[PDB]
A = this chain, B = another copy of it.
Amino acid sequence: LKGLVNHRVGVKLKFNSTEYRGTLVSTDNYFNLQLNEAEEFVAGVSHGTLGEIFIRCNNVLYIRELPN
């Protein structure tokens, strides 16, 4: 996962279809991650900008690299 630090990513949660997008500032094996300039996406539509958020592994389905 460290290969995605300082990259634009999207974190998808288990429930609903919400995706947090931002820059991956940091993380840990535990999949606990810090996201900078995060923006909440629901079914692909922005529902706003949170600032920096710290997200818990458990709620996470997967992480992907947002496209260039």
Q: Which residues of A are interface residues toward B (Cβ below 8 A)?
A: 1, 4, 13-15, 20, 31-32, 34, 38, 50-65, 67
Contact = CB atoms under 8 A, between A and B. Distances in A.
B51 A13 contact: no
Copies of this chain, complex-wide, total 7
A67 B54 contact: no
Contacts of A59: 14, 61-62
Contacts of A32: 1, 31
A59 B56 CA distance: 10
24 contacts: A1-B32, A1-B34, A1-B54, A4-B54, A13-B61, A14-B59, A31-B32, A31-B56, A38-B64, A50-B62, A50-B64, A51-B65, A52-B64, A53-B63, A53-B64, A54-B62, A54-B63, A55-B61, A55-B62, A56-B57, A56-B61, A56-B62, A59-B61, A59-B62
